[PDB]
Amino acid sequence: MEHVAFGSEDIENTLAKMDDGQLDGLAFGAIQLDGDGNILQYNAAEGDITGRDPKQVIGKNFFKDVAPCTDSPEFYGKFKEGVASGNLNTMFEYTFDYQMTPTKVKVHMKKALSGDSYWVFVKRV
Numbered sequence: 001m002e003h004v005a006f007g008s009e010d011i012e013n014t015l016a017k018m019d020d021g022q023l024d025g026l027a028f029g030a031i032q033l034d035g036d037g038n039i040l041q042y043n044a045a046e047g048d049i050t051g052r053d054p055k056q057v058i059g060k061n062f063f064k065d066v067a068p069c070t071d072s073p074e075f076y077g078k079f080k081e082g083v084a085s086g087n088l089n090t091m092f093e094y095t096f097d098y099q100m101t102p103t104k105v106k107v108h109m110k111k112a113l114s115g116d117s118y119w120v121f122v123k124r125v
């Protein structure tokens with residue numbers, strides 16, 4: 001497994017050398033989003049969590065199509081402000097109840113090394 005801890009202070013240099021294949025090795029759910037909210041990478045751990053099929057989520061919009069739960073000032077509002085400022089590093093708890101049993105999760109959003117690209121990390125609590 002990829003021995004990287006949730007909430008690490010350097011996760012972005014770490015998940016830079018990783019391919020999608022190496023991303024599944026993560027002990028937590030990893031989601032990469034472009035600046036518009038579209039999904040570029042989805043990890044199986046995220047899949048084990050949300051039940052969504054990684055292959056069928058890449059290319060879609062997280063806020064609009066896949067996970068309407070984050071369409072609130074408490075998640076999306078933070079993502080949009082983070083994109084606008086070009087710097088995001090925030091952690092919080094949330095509920096994912098769209099087309100699924102209400103599952104309590106820990107969320108960590110951070111700006112990736114790359115210019116317009118953002119990480120979403122999730123792990124059950």
Ligand SMILES: *C(=O)/C=C\c1ccc(O)cc1
Nearest residue numbers: 050067069070096097098
């Ligand atoms: C609300 O967010 C429900 C579900 C959900 C589905 C997929 C992903 O990635 C997160 C959350």
